[PDB]
């Protein structure tokens, strides 16, 4: 009645697995490197041969390579599930108060107190160019937003980004499609874009009227005073959202007319809600009975209009409830839609669907806008047309490999790709890095690669790690000859300002841990699953991706002991003297008086002795 304990005991046995009979079953060696894989026992009557789990491992490592054609055909449902998951788009997760393709993700979509927006995908491949361009532009915008002077970072990252093989600038100049982020990047690079007013996903083109925004203090449903710029005067715009279009006539805090056509239900709802929020209707302002404190990924506070937009996009019912209703006329072309976007004469107050086709306003209008520091696009007249706030928050995986050749985007790695890039960059610039290091100059620590590296160092220990690395490097440079492998290993950590203890000395460490631990650590004196080196073969294995080190290494940095650059302020002396005591912990090394000796164990079989200076 204890399957877990029984299985644990069985796996500790010798030959617990039943093995069939045949040529393939006879291809397993009797024993591999001293490990008994299959029992050489002939059962009396059952004739049942046994094998160890090591036999399964041996088969997977060295067994015959059987044909693997048509495997995806047999398990087609599982591969379809994987494809649906991979091609899907993720929206936003909202807290507080169905197709079979959605029930699959029910665990990741619906919680007791939270809900995740999920758009399933699958075989949407044709327009991979534009999809990848949009994804790249959105990622660039997100990265540049959180940085001071977003425009400079965005322009310097967009120039170093390639979709498949074509530079992102070429994709932007050629495809001409995209979204708000694509337009922002296009204007950032100096290209031309179609001119349309943006409010979230709502594209507006004025066709009649005038407005003069005035600062006012408005009251909202939840009972708070907000400073809003309200628009006065009768204005008319052609509005669009995804696959839906319409005409909006509005006035001061009032929506007069809202004609629209039939389109996707979700697109209809988004267009209609955004039209209400743009109309600045007081009837809309009164529907706010929650808390509007929504922020952006930069951590700043959204402006009131976008606050209301986000609130009502999340909570649409709070508006359709406090929007009233009316009866649409029985004209054939004219219609009405209820809160669920159905065919019902009991329609929303001032909203009406129509049969006649509204000509799309997207006439070729390639112009040259001016982009501000904060990714705000402004006409020659001086009126903001779009900004970072209107960029969609949807996230998806690009259909074509995009690569950003710049350290600023290395943060989008897995903390192992980031380390890989950092150390490959260190190796490539090893000669110049060492030449600059051997000059008494420390600007090298400020390079953008180390910026990216610091994003995976625990903020709590980053200063101590940096102090330790800098002290070790200074010891390896000034008071003693350098070791190339240790210099490479400890150079990235030197960025953060030193956080030396009150004694003035650095913090001694045995390992340096990074984000997502377990195997993401750098051993200060021994090989690690993330950084290993062969002192003789001159091979630097970073994450198992061995790279050579010929030439860059030196003749004199081979006879030197590794124990000269393992603890700051300590220098090897004597040998493994077994009189001082056992291998001291770092705590006693830190507490040791200057001029004292100590014993260390570099690794399994390499004791050494050191002395404080």
């Amino acid at each position: 009645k204890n399957p877990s304990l029984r299985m644990k005991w069985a796996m500790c046995s010798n030959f617990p697995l039943a093995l069939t009979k045949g040529d393939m079953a006879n291809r397993i060696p009797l024993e591999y490197k001293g490990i008994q894989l299959k029992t050489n026992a002939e059962d009396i009557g059952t004739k049942g041969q046994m094998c160890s789990i090591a036999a399964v491992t041996w088969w997977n490592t060295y067994g015959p390579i059987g044909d693997t054609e048509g495997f995806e055909r047999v398990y087609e449902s599982f591969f379809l599930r994987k494809m649906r998951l991979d091609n899907a788009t993720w929206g936003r997760i909202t807290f507080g108060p169905t197709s079979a393709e959605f029930i699959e993700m029910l665990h990741c979509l619906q919680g007791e107190n939270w809900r995740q927006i999920y758009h399933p995908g699958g075989n949407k491949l044709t327009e991979s160019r534009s999809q990848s361009m949009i994804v790249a532009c959105r990622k660039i915008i997100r990265r540049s937003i959180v940085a001071s002077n977003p425009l400079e970072l965005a322009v310097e990252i967009a120039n170093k980004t390639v979709i498949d093989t074509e530079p992102l600038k070429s994709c932007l100049a050629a495809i001409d499609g995209g979204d708000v982020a694509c337009d922002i990047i296009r204007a950032a690079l100096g290209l031309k874009i179609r001119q349309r007013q943006r409010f979230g996903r709502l594209e507006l083109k004025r066709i009649s009227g005038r407005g003069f925004k005035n600062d006012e203090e408005i009251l909202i449903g939840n009972g708070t005073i907000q400073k809003i710029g309200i628009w006065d005067g009768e204005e008319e715009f052609h509005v669009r959202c995804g696959e839906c279009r319409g005409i909006l006539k509005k006035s001061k805090m009032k929506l007069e007319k809202l004609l629209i056509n039939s389109a996707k239900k979700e697109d209809m709802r988004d267009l209609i809600i955004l039209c209400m929020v743009f109309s600045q209707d007081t009837r809309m302002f009164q529907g706010v009975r929650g808390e509007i404190n929504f922020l952006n990924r930069a951590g700043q506070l959204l402006s009131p209009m976008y606050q209301l937009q986000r609130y009502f996009l999340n909570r649409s019912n709070d508006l359709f409830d406090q929007w009233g209703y009316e009866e649409s006329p029985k004209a054939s072309e004219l219609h009405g839609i209820n809160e669920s976007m159905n065919a019902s004469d009991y329609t929303l107050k001032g909203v009406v669907v129509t049969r006649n086709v509204i000509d799309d306003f997207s006439s070729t209008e390639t112009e040259k806008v001016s982009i501000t520091k904060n990714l705000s696009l402004i006409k020659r007249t001086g009126e903001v047309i779009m900004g970072a706030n209107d960029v969609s928050e949807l996230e998806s995986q690009a259909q074509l490999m995009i690569t950003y050749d710049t350290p600023k985007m290395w943060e989008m790695g897995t903390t192992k790709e980031l380390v890989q890039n950092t150390y490959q960059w260190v190796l490539k610039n090893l000669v110049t890095l060492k030449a600059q290091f051997l000059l008494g100059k420390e600007d090298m620590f400020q390079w953008d690669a180390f910026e990216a590296f610091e994003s995976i160092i625990p903020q709590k220990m980053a200063g101590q790690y940096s102090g330790f690395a800098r002290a070790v490097l200074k010891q390896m440079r000034d008071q003693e000859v350098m070791k190339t492998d240790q210099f490479i290993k400890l150079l990235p950590f030197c960025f953060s300002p030193p956080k030396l203890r009150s004694n003035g000395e650095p913090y001694q460490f045995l390992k340096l841990v990074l984000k997502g631990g377990g195997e993401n650590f750098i051993e200060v004196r021994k090989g690690s699953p993330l950084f290993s080196y062969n002192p003789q073969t001159e091979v630097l294995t970073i994450c198992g991706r061995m790279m050579s080190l010929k030439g860059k290494i030196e003749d004199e940095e081979r006879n030197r002991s590794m124990g000269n650059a393992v603890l700051a302020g300590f220098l090897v002396s004597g040998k493994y003297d077994p009189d001082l005591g056992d291998f001291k912990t770092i705590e006693e090394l830190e507490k040791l008086k200057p001029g004292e000796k100590a014993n260390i164990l570099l690794y399994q079989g390499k004791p050494v002795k050191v002395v404080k200076r």
Partner: protein, 706 residues
């Protein structure tokens, strides 16, 4: 199967058949033959009803048809239509759900699809139903059986027979004629009879006032009970009432006041292992996993003075304990661990039999002898003692919630985050482990889990001898160093049985630096020797050995091993707090709660009192307190603690209603208090929880007035 069903039947028929079959079968897709039968039956029913029409007076041509289709619709509405027709037309309602209703003769119609032949299925349907409803039987092969002459004519018969023929041919030529199932097999079983014994048992299972079951059946089937409830409520005694009372703050009194009685003993420590007084002997390693015996051997080699102490300096003795037995058991355990053999078997098994008290077990005798023996009586139950609050529980809570220099948690990795919910969970986990990694409670929990794992592992074939199970752990400090910690040694007894509940004796000898005489009332269950002295950072600390003879079983071993779920419990509690915070807003509040955003300041909690003044702390301190509370709830768990935690919830919810100004009412407040207080006898956690609840209730009362 699905392909042929889709091709040969229109969508409406298929969906109607699926809906009809889903009502009584919970695995509709696992049996498509029933789907075939139902869709064919519905198609036939439509053929009979769709084309035949009628008119107002008698014209069998307006829009009135002469057939009403009761099939293919939900049974709830089908039964309404059937009963309505039967009542309106003055006819009896069949006990079965008919398929059609004929308006020319006003009769319910049952239609069947016979694979074999009609006039045989017809008589089976007659036996099942009888004279309740007319029958229309049509067979795959051309044949029919109708119970009326004015019923379906030849024109409908041709269409139905052709419809059957096409399906028959397709099944014949598509190898699916083997899947077909006749309707008879769905009607299997209507001849259920009651014997002579079951009928008589039924006759004597009727309520008072009935002679036999037939009278009860007729009474239920014929009597209108309207007005009975009010009739019985009018004549019910007024003393039967809820007696509601509007709860106030003055109605909430301290629970279990006897805990403040100083004439009672203070609760003694009774956990399996030392939690905050534990002392582990540390030996640096390279992280390589070692056998428990080898780990203990090396740890004892590093401390030879403690290992080689062969004389007992007795500091404290339990009332019924034998210090000689315990010291000899400890020496046997040490010698066994230090020997070069690979077995943890104790050398002196005969002595260990009596040193552990295993030899003092009563002797089972024949029930006859005991029956004649007038001196054999049932023992009185052991009433738990009534104890008062002990300061050591507060000290344990204070110490276990602090941060140490060692962490025992090293969890594996998971896939990268791609969804926003995954990022939310990852951030929450990051904060949780940052606040909990170096908590003392984490190491204590890991020690408990490892000890119980080792105890259970040694129950495969070693339940008949005496073993020594080291109490060990593996920890890592902020510098990356790895230490093996030996907290003591336990000798595991032996149960001749293997019943998963038989008690096995475990004698635990745990290192400590705590003088037992500083808090005498905490250690009446332990006999303590001073085994030596230790140097840690230039300070000499005395090292005592706490020895105690406890017991357990495989069930308790598994429970202690499962004690690691306190981590998940604390994670879920933190997630609930953060989700409550973010429900007020529309976005996740993890960073706002923990670090604090530009709009939201870092959330602070009330963590305790300092000289009667509330003290605030961060969310990390609150998390450590939550984890320690969960760990102590698990460690001290028993029937009393389970009852106290299940019962005080109602009082807590009443207090929440009072705070929210929801105007709570109660029906028996003293009953609630008695139910809560019956569990406060000797559990240290329950008594401390009562003390803490009284203090917090006083604070809530004082805050209610402001």
């Amino acid at each position: 199967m699905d392909t042929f069903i889709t091709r040969n039947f229109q969508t409406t028929i298929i969906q109607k058949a699926k809906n009809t079959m889903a009502e009584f079968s919970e695995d509709p897709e696992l049996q498509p033959a029933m789907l075939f039968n139902i869709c064919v039956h519905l198609e036939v029913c439509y053929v009979i009803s769709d084309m035949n029409f009628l008119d107002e007076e008698g014209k069998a041509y307006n829009l009135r048809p002469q057939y009403e289709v009761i099939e293919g619709m939900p049974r709830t509405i089908a039964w309404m239509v059937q009963r309505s027709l039967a009542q309106e037309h003055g006819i009896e309602t069949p006990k079965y759900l008919a398929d059609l209703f004929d308006y020319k003769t006003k009769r319910f119609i049952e239609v069947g699809i016979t694979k074999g032949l009609a006039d045989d299925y017809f008589w089976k349907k007659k036996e099942k139903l009888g004279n309740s409803m007319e029958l229309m039987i049509f067979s795959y092969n051309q044949d029919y059986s109708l119970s009326n002459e004015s019923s379906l004519d030849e024109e409908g018969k041709g269409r139905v027979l052709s419809r059957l023929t096409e399906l028959q041919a397709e099944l014949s030529l598509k190898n699916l004629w083997q899947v077909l199932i006749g309707e008879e097999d769905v009607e299997k079983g209507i001849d259920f009879k009651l014997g002579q014994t079951i009928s008589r048992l039924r006759d004597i299972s009727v309520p008072a006032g009935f002679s036999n079951f037939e009278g009860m059946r007729s009474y239920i089937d014929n009597i209108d009970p309207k007005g009975a409830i009010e009739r019985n409520l009018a004549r019910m005694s007024p003393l039967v009432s809820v007696t509601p009372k509007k709860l106030t703050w003055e109605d909430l009194r301290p629970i279990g006041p006897h805990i403040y009685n100083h004439e009672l003993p203070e609760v003694p420590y009774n956990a399996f292992l030392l939690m905050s007084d534990e002392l582990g002997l540390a030996n640096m390693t390279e992280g390589k996993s070692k056998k428990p015996k080898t780990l203990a051997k090396e740890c004892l080699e590093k401390y030879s003075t403690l290992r080689d102490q062969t004389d007992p300096i007795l500091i404290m003795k339990s009332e019924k304990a034998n210090e000689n037995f315990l010291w000899k058991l400890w020496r046997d355990c040490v010698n066994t661990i230090s020997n070069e053999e690979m077995s943890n078997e104790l050398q002196k098994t005969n002595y260990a039999k009596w040193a552990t008290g295993d030899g003092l077990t009563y002797q089972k005798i024949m029930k006859e002898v005991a029956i004649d023996d007038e001196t054999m009586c049932q023992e009185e139950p052991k009433i738990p003692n009534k104890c008062r609050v002990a300061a050591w529980v507060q000290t344990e809570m204070n110490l276990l919630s602090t941060l140490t220099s060692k962490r025992a948690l090293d969890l594996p990795e998971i896939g990268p985050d791609v969804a926003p919910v995954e990022h939310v969970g990852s951030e929450r986990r990051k904060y949780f482990v940052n606040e909990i990694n170096y908590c003392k409670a984490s190491t204590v929990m890991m020690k408990y889990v490892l000890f119980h794992t080792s105890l259970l592992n040694e129950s495969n074939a070693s339940m008949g001898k005496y073993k020594v199970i080291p109490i060990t752990n593996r920890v890592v400090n902020e510098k990356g160093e790895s230490f093996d910690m030996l907290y003591g040694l336990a000798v595991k007894g032996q149960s001749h049985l293997r019943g998963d509940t038989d008690v096995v004796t475990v004698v635990t000898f745990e290192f400590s630096s705590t003088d037992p005489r500083v808090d005498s009332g905490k250690w009446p269950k332990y006999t303590v020797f001073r085994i030596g002295s230790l140097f840690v950072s230039g300070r000499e600390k005395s090292v005592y050995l706490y020895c105690r003879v406890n017991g357990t079983n495989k069930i308790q071993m598994k429970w202690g091993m499962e004690a690691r779920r306190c981590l998940l419990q604390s994670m879920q509690q933190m997630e609930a707090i953060v989700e409550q915070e973010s429900s007020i807003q529309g976005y996740d509040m993890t960073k706002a709660c923990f670090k604090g955003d530009r709009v939201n300041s870092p959330k602070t909690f009330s963590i305790g009192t300092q000289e009667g003044k509330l003290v605030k702390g961060s969310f990390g301190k609150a998390l450590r307190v939550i984890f320690t509370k969960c760990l102590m709830h698990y460690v001290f768990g028993n029937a009393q603690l389970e009852g106290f935690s299940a019962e005080s919830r109602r009082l807590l919810l009443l207090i929440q209603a009072l705070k929210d100004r929801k105007g709570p009412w109660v029906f028996d407040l003293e009953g609630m208090y008695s139910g809560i207080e019956e569990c406060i006898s000797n559990n240290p956690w329950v008594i401390q929880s009562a003390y803490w609840f009284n203090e917090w209730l006083g604070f809530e009362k004082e805050g209610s007035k402001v």
